[PDB]
């Protein structure tokens, strides 16, 4: 299953990728470039692409985009200053025709921080309630502790069962 | 600053700086500058990273890609200015650049390196940049090359739709301010990557990874950390009871000494072309001591003991070396490693006692 993991820098994407992969054998040095790992969950294998290529290199990824089945959008729930920018980046992605059928999992990350906005608050800030023809789920997480990650994967595996 | 040519303590301090860098690059650099091992200019630090062995190339990339630190940005610019990109095609230039640093990981890190690289390539090749309706086309193409390298060579992609020379060409349509980059240029770039992968030069950690894969049991708890260097390999015979005798070749262990750890293994296959290790136990060096012993049964004996505060003295393991020479060699290396580990922890407790203020 092809998964694209996006969100602003410092949201926790790379932390999530390695936390998720941690349980599977790393016998070799990963190839030069961005992060990509295959994660097996409830007998379903997900190839997760951890991306962030500005907007200058945004036209690329479009090759993959056609075959992307799921999107993981990671948000730093403590970063109020950049929440609108996160919304913009999400909506810019969702506008792509190539992703019209992709399912959306939102990780409202950094819930361990005392001033973190709740999943309900993030839902409002990202305008998720306005989306119609889309399968979406928001999951409160703390990537450092692993809390909420497998609950997110439960929803995503159920959406994609291939 | 050092003693007779090169001093045990100064060499230990230099190695401590490198150990600190490989854990935290900003902290390692500061330490080296303060201890007069590196001059304070961005050019000096750039040279140091480029030349001086013992630095993790992933960590060199982590430091150089820092985008927020003004010092790091200047270090990167000096680093890139030392490179000769004139008359090279983009892939050839990138091969050269990516050999000195590991251009892998976080998108923002990869972007910062690569943006610095692209600026330099364009300066060295102004006739190429004129062909383009947009200068950012070199930056975009640099990432298309990086992305191709990942697509072709990452096993997580699998020959699903691993890019053909046609998929690579079409993916880049319209990149040059609405127009295309030359078909033949893209074909060339593609065929060059297909013929040879972008790899990064052999690191001090390359050797640790080589060892780690030969070990079969519990790999030995991911020993290939950036800071970890392999001091030496040595065969020694394990002595369960120094008070009782034993057969000569009995309990043949294979020791691997890393700057912070001692790994012990029984062998597995030996085979012909390659040897594989079993993994018996792992010993942290902190708080450990080494002592030589000779009795009626063991001539070149060694006893490793750990002295923890309160529970004081524990006999971890006992060994017999095949010759006095090997005993001396191993003991000297292990003793130096312990002292290196001692001052490292001595430092981080002091560094933390200052943080609390
Ligand atoms: N407290 C907390 N921190 C988190 C959590 N998830 C990620 N982080 C932090 O977020 C920072 C950047 O995250 P990362 O996974 O590198 O991100 P990316 O989206 O930039 O690829 C890191 O901070 P540093 O670089 O300062 O270590 C990491 O420790 C979380 O749930 N809680």
Residue numbers in the entry:
A (entry chain G): 18 to 179
B (entry chain B): 393 to 610, 620 to 758
Paper excerpt:
They are activated by guanine nucleotide exchange factors (ArfGEFs) that share a conserved Sec7 domain, which stimulates GDP/GTP exchange. Members of this family carry a calmodulin-binding IQ motif in their N-terminus, a Sec7 nucleotide exchange domain followed by a PH domain and a predicted coiled-coil in their C-terminus. The crystal structure of an Arf1–BRAG2 complex that mimics a membrane-bound intermediate revealed an atypical PH domain that is constitutively anchored to the catalytic Sec7 domain and interacts with Arf.
We confirmed that BRAG2 has the hallmarks of an Arf1–GEF by showing that a mutant in which the catalytic glutamate was replaced by a lysine (BRAG2Sec7-PH/E498K) traps Arf1–GDP in an early intermediate of the exchange reaction and that removal of GDP yields the subsequent nucleotide-free Arf/ArfGEF intermediate. This allowed us to solve the crystal structure of the Arf1–GDP/BRAG2Sec7-PH/E498K complex in two crystal forms (crystallographic statistics in Table S1). First, instead of forming an isolated domain, the PH domain is expanded by the linker that bridges the Sec7 and PH domains (residues 592–627), which forms a small subdomain rather than an unstructured tether. Finally, the PH domain of BRAG2 displays a striking sequence difference with phosphoinositide-specific PH domains: Glu639 in strand β1 replaces a highly conserved lysine in the canonical lipid-binding pocket (as reviewed in). First, it shows that Arf1 forms edge contacts with the PH domain. The interface involves the switch 1 of Arf1 and the Sec7-PH linker subdomain and is loosely packed (250–450 Å2 buried surface area). Next, the structure shows that BRAG2-bound Arf1–GDP has undergone a two-residue shift of the interswitch, a conformational change that has been shown to occur prior to GDP dissociation and to secure active Arf proteins to membranes (, reviewed in), suggesting that the complex mimics a membrane-bound intermediate of the exchange reaction.
